[model samples]
Target: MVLILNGPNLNLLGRREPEVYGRTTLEELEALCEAWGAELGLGVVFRQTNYEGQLIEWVQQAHQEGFLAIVLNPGALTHYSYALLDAIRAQPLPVVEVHLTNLHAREEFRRHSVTAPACRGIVSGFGPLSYKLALVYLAET
Candidate 1:
């Protein structure tokens, strides 16, 4: 099983920035991930939360809940959030950070991720396909 967590404003994907993030709603993304999970032979538990602590709690308990891996899109929290990094570091499973946009191509702040070092890797710049690639990586490994 894989735990996919979306943080903060990601719930506003399509509505937030059609030009950058595309027209995929959070519900649509979840459905797509479910379908992809089926294709990959992995069960996906998709979740979204606006609260930072809520995301942290989920990450902390993911391994205990029996998830094989994690795909996380921490939205703006990627730039900072040492607590999240610590939570990831403490977790035993592999975590792959994902971003809808090419953070380095956007704002300077987006270029840095305090949480990336704790993750197995990161996938970005391909919009919704970023999640697909992350899932593929998790499945293959």
Candidate 2:
């Protein structure tokens, strides 16, 4: 089982900056995840939130619910938010951090990931495929 968690402005996916996030909507991403989960025989719980507290709550709940792993794209919050790092650390689950765009290749501010240290691995620069890659890694583990 895996929890695919999107944070902050990700809910505005397709309508947002197309040059970066691409034309794929949040619903499209969820559908793709579901399909992939089915093929992998892995249960998936998809969630998105613009609120930090709500994201934190979901992570806590996922941990309590016995989710096997978590695929998180914290969006803009990845550059900050120590609380999220703490929540992920407390969970004791393998977390795979993802980014749609190449954070390191962009602006300097985007290069730093405050929460990356807490995760088992970080996947970036692969666009929407990053999520799929994360899922693959988690499944293999």
Candidate 3:
């Protein structure tokens, strides 16, 4: 099974940022991922959390549970979360880092992704579609 993990303030997606992030809610994204998983003949386990530690624990558990792959949008934590990078690097599971916006084109601080290097691949700048692409990449890998 593949895990779709979202982090920090993403639960407030539609309500928070209708401009850059778009109007899609977190649940809607998960449903879309489920549909995509069905099309790819893969099982998807979707989860979202505002807590950093909880996100870390989920990644660790994904490794232990032997998940086929991980599609993660670590939200704001992508900027300065070495602990998260460490967790991803320690895991044997393949992971794809995803972002709704093109982080490099955004603010100066947002351009730097501390976790991207640890993942198998990084997808961004396609808005909500980036998550779908991440899922597809996981299937291909």
Candidate 4:
């Protein structure tokens, strides 16, 4: 199974800023991801958290928990979480970072992802499709 993790304010998805994030709630996105995963013959364990350590601990324990890979949207922590980066680096499973919007096209500060260095790759700018794309890559590899 693959672990899909959403960070911070993503729980407020759709409602927080419909114009930017679209009108899909977090649960709706989770359902969509599960559907896509099933189509690809992959089981998905979706989770969300506003806490940093909780995210870190999940990453740390993912391999033991039987997840083959991780699909993560670290929200704001993407820019500064060295601990998360290290955890990814230390882990055996592959990780793919994802974002709903194109970071490079937005604020300059958003362009950098500290965690990307430790990830296999990133899927961005394609809304929820980004998650499917990452799953496709995981399915292939």
Each model's C-alpha lDDT?
A: 0.92, 0.88, 0.88, 0.94
Off by over 4 Å in 2: none
- lDDT comparing candidate 1 with the true structure: 0.92
Best-fitting candidate, scored by lDDT = 4
- The clash count for each model shown is 0, 0, 0, 0
Q: Kindly list the per-residue Cα lDDT of model 3 for residues 20-58, writing each as its tens digit.
A: 788888889889889988899889999999888999999
Query: Model 3 Cα displacement at 51 (Å)?
Result: 0.9
Candidate 4 positional error at 106, Å: 1.6
| lDDT string, candidate 4, 73-141, tens digits | 999999999989998988899999999989998788999999998899999999999999999999999
Model 1, range 1-141, lDDT digits (tens) per residue?
999999899888777867878998999998999999899898999999988899999999999999999999999998888889998998899999998899989889899999999999999998888999999999998
Q: How does model 3 fare in lDDT?
A: 0.88
Candidate 1 deviant stretches above 4 angstroms: none
Q: Per-candidate TM vs. native?
A: 0.97, 0.96, 0.96, 0.98
* Model 2 Cα lDDT, one tens digit per residue, 114-139: 99999999998787789888888887
Error of 4 at 10 (Å): 0.5
Poorest 10 consecutive residues by lDDT, candidate 2 = 55-64
Once model 3 is optimally superposed onto the true structure by TM-score, how far is the C-alpha of residue 70 displaced, in angstroms? 0.7
Candidate 3 C-alpha error for residue 1, in Å: 1.0
